[PDB]
Protein backbone atom coordinates (compact mmCIF):
# COMPACT_ATOMS: atom_id res chain seq x y z
CA UNK A 1 0.00 0.00 0.00
CA UNK A 2 2.96 2.41 -0.09
CA UNK A 3 3.16 2.83 -3.83
CA UNK A 4 1.38 5.97 -4.93
CA UNK A 5 1.14 9.66 -4.12
CA UNK A 6 1.40 11.06 -0.60
CA UNK A 7 0.83 14.54 0.75
CA UNK A 8 2.12 16.04 3.93
CA UNK A 9 0.29 18.46 6.17
CA UNK A 10 1.73 21.54 4.49
CA UNK A 11 1.94 21.43 0.70
CA UNK A 12 4.55 18.81 -0.10
CA UNK A 13 3.96 15.82 -2.28
CA UNK A 14 5.82 12.69 -3.07
CA UNK A 15 5.30 9.94 -5.57
CA UNK A 16 6.82 6.65 -4.56
CA UNK A 17 7.17 3.20 -5.96
CA UNK A 18 7.74 0.35 -3.48
CA UNK A 19 9.72 -2.42 -5.24
CA UNK A 20 9.48 -6.16 -4.44
CA UNK A 21 13.05 -6.03 -3.21
CA UNK A 22 12.41 -3.41 -0.53
CA UNK A 23 13.47 -0.44 -2.62
CA UNK A 24 11.68 2.93 -2.46
CA UNK A 25 12.06 5.22 -5.44
CA UNK A 26 10.29 8.39 -6.42
CA UNK A 27 10.02 12.10 -6.58
CA UNK A 28 9.70 14.76 -3.92
CA UNK A 29 8.03 18.04 -4.90
CA UNK A 30 8.19 20.98 -2.48
CA UNK A 31 7.39 23.73 -11.38
CA UNK A 32 10.00 21.12 -12.25
CA UNK A 33 12.36 23.23 -10.20
CA UNK A 34 11.02 22.07 -6.83
CA UNK A 35 11.27 18.38 -7.74
CA UNK A 36 13.91 16.13 -6.29
CA UNK A 37 14.90 12.49 -6.39
CA UNK A 38 13.83 10.31 -3.50
CA UNK A 39 15.41 7.02 -2.58
CA UNK A 40 14.91 4.63 0.29
CA UNK A 41 14.19 1.20 1.70
CA UNK A 42 11.23 -0.45 3.45
CA UNK A 43 10.49 -3.73 5.19
CA UNK A 44 9.19 -5.83 2.31
CA UNK A 45 7.94 -8.50 4.69
CA UNK A 46 6.30 -6.90 7.68
CA UNK A 47 4.40 -8.45 10.56
CA UNK A 48 0.62 -8.93 10.22
CA UNK A 49 -0.17 -8.36 13.88
CA UNK A 50 -1.14 -4.76 13.40
CA UNK A 51 2.35 -3.30 13.45
CA UNK A 52 3.26 -0.73 10.87
CA UNK A 53 5.89 -1.20 8.22
CA UNK A 54 9.32 0.31 8.80
CA UNK A 55 10.71 2.57 6.12
CA UNK A 56 13.09 5.44 5.43
CA UNK A 57 14.10 7.67 2.57
CA UNK A 58 16.54 10.43 1.62
CA UNK A 59 16.22 13.56 -0.45
CA UNK A 60 19.31 15.60 -1.37
CA UNK A 61 17.97 19.06 -2.31
CA UNK A 62 19.89 19.45 -5.53
CA UNK A 63 18.33 19.26 -9.02
CA UNK A 64 19.34 20.71 -12.38
CA UNK A 65 17.96 24.10 -11.34
CA UNK A 66 18.98 24.62 -7.71
CA UNK A 67 21.02 23.32 -4.79
CA UNK A 68 20.31 23.95 -1.14
CA UNK A 69 23.43 22.02 -0.06
CA UNK A 70 21.28 20.03 2.31
CA UNK A 71 19.81 16.54 2.66
CA UNK A 72 16.83 15.25 4.58
CA UNK A 73 16.18 11.75 5.83
CA UNK A 74 12.77 10.52 6.94
CA UNK A 75 12.47 7.54 9.26
CA UNK A 76 9.10 6.14 10.22
CA UNK A 77 6.40 3.72 9.42
CA UNK A 78 3.50 3.10 7.09
CA UNK A 79 0.23 2.28 8.74
CA UNK A 80 -2.53 1.00 6.51
CA UNK A 81 -6.23 0.84 7.15
CA UNK A 82 -9.04 3.04 5.96
CA UNK A 83 -6.95 5.91 7.30
CA UNK A 84 -3.56 5.07 5.85
CA UNK A 85 -0.63 7.19 6.95
CA UNK A 86 3.14 7.28 6.93
CA UNK A 87 4.27 8.70 10.27
CA UNK A 88 7.81 10.05 10.29
CA UNK A 89 10.56 11.85 12.08
CA UNK A 90 13.14 13.56 9.93
CA UNK A 91 16.64 14.95 10.04
CA UNK A 92 17.70 17.86 7.87
CA UNK A 93 21.42 18.33 7.52
CA UNK A 94 23.13 21.22 5.75
CA UNK A 95 26.70 21.63 4.58
CA UNK A 96 28.44 23.86 7.15
CA UNK A 97 32.08 24.56 7.98
CA UNK A 98 33.69 22.90 11.02
CA UNK A 99 32.93 25.86 13.31
CA UNK A 100 29.21 25.62 12.60
CA UNK A 101 28.84 21.86 12.58
CA UNK A 102 27.00 22.23 15.91
CA UNK A 103 24.07 23.91 14.18
CA UNK A 104 24.04 21.68 11.13
CA UNK A 105 21.00 19.48 11.79
CA UNK A 106 17.30 20.22 12.23
CA UNK A 107 14.83 17.63 13.54
CA UNK A 108 11.08 17.46 13.02
CA UNK A 109 8.26 15.13 12.09
CA UNK A 110 5.89 14.70 9.20
CA UNK A 111 2.65 12.77 8.66
CA UNK A 112 1.75 11.79 5.10
CA UNK A 113 -1.73 10.76 3.92
CA UNK A 114 -3.08 9.46 0.63
CA UNK A 115 -5.44 12.40 0.27
CA UNK B 1 36.00 10.93 -1.61
CA UNK B 2 32.74 9.53 -0.28
CA UNK B 3 33.21 6.42 -2.38
CA UNK B 4 34.91 3.76 -0.25
CA UNK B 5 34.81 1.58 2.84
CA UNK B 6 33.95 3.33 6.09
CA UNK B 7 33.86 2.18 9.70
CA UNK B 8 32.04 3.55 12.69
CA UNK B 9 33.19 3.67 16.27
CA UNK B 10 31.55 0.40 17.27
CA UNK B 11 32.96 -1.59 14.34
CA UNK B 12 30.22 -1.77 11.75
CA UNK B 13 31.27 -1.41 8.14
CA UNK B 14 29.68 0.41 5.24
CA UNK B 15 30.82 0.12 1.62
CA UNK B 16 29.44 2.95 -0.50
CA UNK B 17 29.57 4.10 -4.07
CA UNK B 18 28.94 7.74 -4.87
CA UNK B 19 27.83 8.15 -8.46
CA UNK B 20 25.07 9.59 -10.63
CA UNK B 21 23.68 13.01 -10.08
CA UNK B 22 24.14 12.22 -6.39
CA UNK B 23 23.27 8.57 -5.92
CA UNK B 24 24.55 6.59 -2.94
CA UNK B 25 24.55 2.82 -3.25
CA UNK B 26 26.12 0.12 -1.12
CA UNK B 27 25.98 -2.25 1.82
CA UNK B 28 26.05 -2.04 5.61
CA UNK B 29 27.61 -4.82 7.68
CA UNK B 30 27.84 -5.44 11.43
CA UNK B 31 29.27 -12.21 7.59
CA UNK B 32 26.63 -12.42 4.84
CA UNK B 33 23.88 -12.78 7.41
CA UNK B 34 24.78 -9.31 8.66
CA UNK B 35 24.92 -7.60 5.28
CA UNK B 36 22.12 -5.28 4.17
CA UNK B 37 21.45 -3.02 1.21
CA UNK B 38 22.04 0.65 1.64
CA UNK B 39 20.67 3.47 -0.46
CA UNK B 40 20.85 7.22 -0.27
CA UNK B 41 21.68 10.54 -1.86
CA UNK B 42 24.37 13.23 -1.58
CA UNK B 43 25.09 16.80 -2.65
CA UNK B 44 27.02 16.24 -5.87
CA UNK B 45 27.94 19.93 -6.05
CA UNK B 46 28.86 21.21 -2.63
CA UNK B 47 29.99 24.69 -1.71
CA UNK B 48 33.60 25.76 -2.33
CA UNK B 49 33.95 27.63 0.97
CA UNK B 50 35.10 24.70 3.12
CA UNK B 51 31.62 23.48 3.99
CA UNK B 52 31.05 19.74 4.20
CA UNK B 53 28.94 17.68 1.82
CA UNK B 54 25.44 16.84 2.98
CA UNK B 55 24.23 13.30 2.56
CA UNK B 56 21.80 10.74 3.92
CA UNK B 57 21.14 7.06 3.59
CA UNK B 58 18.71 4.35 4.63
CA UNK B 59 19.11 0.77 5.70
CA UNK B 60 16.09 -1.45 6.26
CA UNK B 61 17.10 -4.43 8.40
CA UNK B 62 15.80 -7.20 6.22
CA UNK B 63 17.89 -9.56 4.13
CA UNK B 64 17.55 -13.14 2.93
CA UNK B 65 18.14 -14.50 6.43
CA UNK B 66 16.86 -11.91 8.86
CA UNK B 67 14.20 -9.24 9.36
CA UNK B 68 14.35 -6.95 12.39
CA UNK B 69 11.29 -5.08 11.18
CA UNK B 70 13.02 -1.77 11.35
CA UNK B 71 14.88 0.82 9.28
CA UNK B 72 17.67 3.27 10.01
CA UNK B 73 18.38 6.57 8.38
CA UNK B 74 21.65 8.49 8.66
CA UNK B 75 21.69 12.23 8.01
CA UNK B 76 25.03 13.96 7.93
CA UNK B 77 27.97 15.38 6.14
CA UNK B 78 31.23 14.37 4.59
CA UNK B 79 34.30 16.39 5.51
CA UNK B 80 37.24 15.97 3.14
CA UNK B 81 39.42 18.00 5.53
CA UNK B 82 42.15 16.46 7.68
CA UNK B 83 41.38 12.76 7.85
CA UNK B 84 38.12 12.41 5.94
CA UNK B 85 35.11 11.74 8.15
CA UNK B 86 31.33 11.39 7.91
CA UNK B 87 29.60 12.81 11.00
CA UNK B 88 26.00 11.66 11.23
CA UNK B 89 22.88 11.69 13.28
CA UNK B 90 20.56 8.75 12.91
CA UNK B 91 17.01 7.63 13.54
CA UNK B 92 16.10 3.96 13.93
CA UNK B 93 12.39 3.25 13.61
CA UNK B 94 10.80 -0.09 14.43
CA UNK B 95 7.37 -1.22 13.33
CA UNK B 96 5.09 -0.98 16.42
CA UNK B 97 1.39 -1.15 16.97
CA UNK B 98 -0.23 2.26 17.09
CA UNK B 99 -0.31 2.24 20.90
CA UNK B 100 3.45 1.72 21.19
CA UNK B 101 4.30 4.18 18.42
CA UNK B 102 5.54 6.70 21.00
CA UNK B 103 8.52 4.43 21.62
CA UNK B 104 9.23 3.40 18.04
CA UNK B 105 12.22 5.63 17.28
CA UNK B 106 15.73 5.72 18.61
CA UNK B 107 18.13 8.57 17.95
CA UNK B 108 21.92 8.52 18.10
CA UNK B 109 25.04 9.71 16.30
CA UNK B 110 27.84 8.01 14.41
CA UNK B 111 31.18 9.11 13.02
CA UNK B 112 32.75 7.24 10.13
CA UNK B 113 36.38 7.10 9.01
CA UNK B 114 38.10 5.07 6.32
CA UNK B 115 40.16 3.59 9.19
CA UNK C 1 -0.43 31.68 29.48
CA UNK C 2 1.89 28.76 30.14
CA UNK C 3 0.73 28.40 33.73
CA UNK C 4 -2.01 25.83 33.99
CA UNK C 5 -2.88 22.20 33.39
CA UNK C 6 -1.92 20.80 30.01
CA UNK C 7 -2.70 17.45 28.33
CA UNK C 8 -0.95 15.75 25.45
CA UNK C 9 -2.38 13.64 22.67
CA UNK C 10 -1.92 10.51 24.81
CA UNK C 11 -3.77 11.79 27.87
CA UNK C 12 -0.80 12.64 30.04
CA UNK C 13 -1.23 15.62 32.33
CA UNK C 14 1.24 18.45 32.85
CA UNK C 15 0.60 20.88 35.69
CA UNK C 16 3.09 23.71 35.53
CA UNK C 17 3.75 27.09 37.02
CA UNK C 18 5.66 29.70 35.01
CA UNK C 19 7.62 31.95 37.36
CA UNK C 20 8.54 35.58 36.68
CA UNK C 21 12.27 34.72 36.45
CA UNK C 22 11.80 32.10 33.66
CA UNK C 23 11.47 29.07 35.93
CA UNK C 24 9.06 26.28 35.22
CA UNK C 25 7.97 24.03 38.06
CA UNK C 26 5.24 21.48 38.39
CA UNK C 27 4.23 17.92 38.07
CA UNK C 28 3.80 15.38 35.31
CA UNK C 29 1.51 12.42 35.19
CA UNK C 30 2.01 10.00 32.29
CA UNK C 31 1.54 8.58 39.79
CA UNK C 32 2.96 12.14 39.50
CA UNK C 33 6.63 13.05 38.86
CA UNK C 34 8.43 16.33 39.58
CA UNK C 35 9.17 18.49 36.57
CA UNK C 36 11.47 21.46 36.32
CA UNK C 37 12.52 23.67 33.44
CA UNK C 38 13.05 27.09 31.96
CA UNK C 39 11.26 29.39 29.54
CA UNK C 40 11.86 32.69 27.74
CA UNK C 41 10.25 35.22 30.06
CA UNK C 42 10.61 37.94 27.41
CA UNK C 43 10.01 36.63 23.91
CA UNK C 44 9.79 38.53 20.62
CA UNK C 45 6.94 40.95 19.76
CA UNK C 46 6.90 39.74 16.15
CA UNK C 47 4.42 36.90 16.65
CA UNK C 48 7.15 34.39 17.51
CA UNK C 49 6.30 31.63 19.97
CA UNK C 50 7.90 31.36 23.41
CA UNK C 51 10.86 28.95 23.71
CA UNK C 52 10.79 26.59 26.71
CA UNK C 53 11.96 23.20 27.92
CA UNK C 54 11.62 20.92 30.92
CA UNK C 55 12.79 17.62 32.35
CA UNK C 56 11.12 14.81 34.27
CA UNK C 57 13.13 11.93 35.79
CA UNK C 58 10.85 8.88 36.14
CA UNK C 59 11.46 8.26 39.78
CA UNK C 60 8.98 8.80 42.59
CA UNK C 61 7.99 6.93 45.78
CA UNK C 62 6.23 4.13 43.88
CA UNK C 63 8.49 3.25 40.95
CA UNK C 64 11.75 4.11 39.23
CA UNK C 65 12.10 3.63 35.46
CA UNK C 66 15.72 4.82 35.56
CA UNK C 67 14.89 7.32 32.86
CA UNK C 68 14.62 11.00 32.21
CA UNK C 69 12.78 12.80 29.45
CA UNK C 70 13.39 16.31 28.27
CA UNK C 71 10.87 18.27 26.22
CA UNK C 72 12.05 21.20 24.13
CA UNK C 73 9.57 23.38 22.30
CA UNK C 74 7.51 26.47 22.24
CA UNK C 75 4.25 27.92 23.45
CA UNK C 76 1.96 29.59 20.94
CA UNK C 77 -0.84 31.67 22.44
CA UNK C 78 -4.11 31.98 20.59
CA UNK C 79 -7.76 31.01 20.71
CA UNK C 80 -6.43 27.46 21.07
CA UNK C 81 -3.20 27.78 23.08
CA UNK C 82 -0.79 24.95 22.45
CA UNK C 83 2.71 23.77 23.30
CA UNK C 84 4.59 22.01 20.49
CA UNK C 85 7.52 19.93 21.67
CA UNK C 86 10.11 17.44 20.61
CA UNK C 87 11.39 15.18 23.36
CA UNK C 88 14.29 12.85 24.16
CA UNK C 89 13.87 9.99 26.58
CA UNK C 90 17.11 8.59 27.95
CA UNK C 91 17.33 5.42 30.03
CA UNK C 92 20.32 4.25 32.06
CA UNK C 93 22.17 1.50 30.12
CA UNK C 94 25.58 -0.12 30.30
CA UNK C 95 28.27 1.13 27.93
CA UNK C 96 27.70 -1.51 25.25
CA UNK C 97 23.99 -0.70 25.15
CA UNK C 98 24.26 3.08 25.18
CA UNK C 99 23.59 3.19 21.43
CA UNK C 100 19.97 2.29 22.12
CA UNK C 101 19.63 4.53 25.20
CA UNK C 102 17.61 7.32 23.67
CA UNK C 103 14.12 7.61 22.18
CA UNK C 104 12.93 10.62 20.29
CA UNK C 105 9.36 11.77 19.73
CA UNK C 106 7.04 14.75 19.59
CA UNK C 107 4.31 15.83 21.99
CA UNK C 108 1.58 18.41 21.45
CA UNK C 109 0.06 19.86 24.62
CA UNK C 110 -3.29 21.56 24.88
CA UNK C 111 -5.43 23.05 27.68
CA UNK C 112 -8.38 20.90 26.66
CA UNK C 113 -8.29 17.20 27.36
CA UNK C 114 -8.56 14.49 24.70
CA UNK D 1 29.81 12.24 41.28
CA UNK D 2 27.64 14.69 39.36
CA UNK D 3 28.02 17.64 41.68
CA UNK D 4 30.76 19.86 40.29
CA UNK D 5 32.16 21.58 37.23
CA UNK D 6 31.74 19.95 33.83
CA UNK D 7 33.27 20.84 30.53
CA UNK D 8 32.26 20.01 26.93
CA UNK D 9 34.55 19.96 23.92
CA UNK D 10 33.62 23.50 22.91
CA UNK D 11 34.89 25.34 25.97
CA UNK D 12 31.43 25.69 27.55
CA UNK D 13 31.28 25.09 31.23
CA UNK D 14 28.55 23.91 33.53
CA UNK D 15 28.51 23.94 37.35
CA UNK D 16 25.81 21.74 38.86
CA UNK D 17 24.69 20.68 42.26
CA UNK D 18 22.80 17.39 42.52
CA UNK D 19 20.29 17.59 45.36
CA UNK D 20 19.57 14.49 47.38
CA UNK D 21 16.23 13.77 45.77
CA UNK D 22 16.86 14.34 42.10
CA UNK D 23 17.29 18.05 41.68
CA UNK D 24 19.90 19.52 39.34
CA UNK D 25 20.64 23.22 39.81
CA UNK D 26 23.46 25.29 38.38
CA UNK D 27 24.74 27.66 35.76
CA UNK D 28 25.83 27.32 32.14
CA UNK D 29 28.60 29.62 30.98
CA UNK D 30 31.47 30.20 28.52
CA UNK D 31 31.82 36.38 31.94
CA UNK D 32 28.44 37.34 33.33
CA UNK D 33 27.06 38.09 29.87
CA UNK D 34 27.41 34.46 28.95
CA UNK D 35 25.99 33.02 32.14
CA UNK D 36 22.59 31.36 32.33
CA UNK D 37 20.61 29.39 34.89
CA UNK D 38 20.23 25.66 34.54
CA UNK D 39 17.79 23.30 36.09
CA UNK D 40 17.12 19.61 35.65
CA UNK D 41 16.53 16.26 37.28
CA UNK D 42 18.47 13.01 37.69
CA UNK D 43 17.65 9.49 38.88
CA UNK D 44 18.69 9.63 42.55
CA UNK D 45 18.60 5.82 42.74
CA UNK D 46 20.22 4.24 39.68
CA UNK D 47 20.53 0.51 38.93
CA UNK D 48 23.57 -1.26 40.32
CA UNK D 49 24.15 -3.29 37.17
CA UNK D 50 26.85 -0.85 36.06
CA UNK D 51 24.20 1.02 34.11
CA UNK D 52 24.55 4.78 34.00
CA UNK D 53 22.52 7.42 35.73
CA UNK D 54 19.79 9.05 33.74
CA UNK D 55 19.45 12.80 33.83
CA UNK D 56 18.42 15.88 31.96
CA UNK D 57 18.48 19.61 32.18
CA UNK D 58 17.37 22.80 30.49
CA UNK D 59 18.89 26.16 29.77
CA UNK D 60 16.86 29.00 28.33
CA UNK D 61 19.25 31.53 26.70
CA UNK D 62 18.12 34.69 28.47
CA UNK D 63 19.93 36.47 31.28
CA UNK D 64 20.00 40.05 32.51
CA UNK D 65 22.15 41.00 29.50
CA UNK D 66 20.80 39.24 26.46
CA UNK D 67 17.98 37.08 25.06
CA UNK D 68 18.42 34.58 22.25
CA UNK D 69 14.76 33.53 22.57
CA UNK D 70 15.97 29.94 22.68
CA UNK D 71 15.96 27.02 25.07
CA UNK D 72 18.17 23.93 24.99
CA UNK D 73 17.45 20.67 26.73
CA UNK D 74 20.08 17.98 27.28
CA UNK D 75 19.06 14.38 27.82
CA UNK D 76 21.63 11.78 28.71
CA UNK D 77 23.41 9.81 31.35
CA UNK D 78 26.19 10.20 33.84
CA UNK D 79 28.82 7.53 33.59
CA UNK D 80 30.98 7.38 36.70
CA UNK D 81 34.54 6.34 37.43
CA UNK D 82 37.94 7.89 36.90
CA UNK D 83 36.91 9.02 33.43
CA UNK D 84 33.54 10.22 34.66
CA UNK D 85 31.52 11.58 31.76
CA UNK D 86 28.06 12.82 30.97
CA UNK D 87 26.94 11.73 27.48
CA UNK D 88 24.01 13.68 26.08
CA UNK D 89 21.85 14.38 23.09
CA UNK D 90 20.23 17.79 22.90
CA UNK D 91 17.43 19.78 21.35
CA UNK D 92 17.71 23.51 20.83
CA UNK D 93 14.40 25.20 20.09
CA UNK D 94 14.00 28.81 19.00
CA UNK D 95 10.80 30.83 19.05
CA UNK D 96 9.47 31.18 15.50
CA UNK D 97 6.26 32.28 13.87
CA UNK D 98 4.04 29.35 12.89
CA UNK D 99 5.41 29.62 9.34
CA UNK D 100 9.00 28.90 10.44
CA UNK D 101 8.28 26.18 13.01
CA UNK D 102 9.63 23.34 10.77
CA UNK D 103 13.03 24.93 11.19
CA UNK D 104 12.79 25.77 14.88
CA UNK D 105 14.59 22.79 16.44
CA UNK D 106 18.26 21.78 16.19
CA UNK D 107 19.40 18.39 17.39
CA UNK D 108 22.91 17.33 18.37
CA UNK D 109 25.13 15.58 20.92
CA UNK D 110 27.61 16.65 23.59
CA UNK D 111 29.97 14.87 25.99
CA UNK D 112 30.92 16.39 29.34
CA UNK D 113 34.13 15.76 31.29
CA UNK D 114 35.46 16.77 34.72
CA UNK D 115 38.72 17.85 33.11
From Swiss-Prot, chain C:
The keyword Lipoprotein does not apply. The keyword Secreted applies. GO terms for molecular function: biotin binding. GO terms for cellular component: extracellular region. It is found in: Secreted. It comes from the Bacteria. Homotetramer. This is Streptavidin. It comes from Streptomyces avidinii.
Amino acid sequence: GITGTWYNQLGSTFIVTAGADGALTGTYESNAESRYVLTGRYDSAPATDGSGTALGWTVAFKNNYRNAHSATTWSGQYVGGAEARINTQWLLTSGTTEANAWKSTLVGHDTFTKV
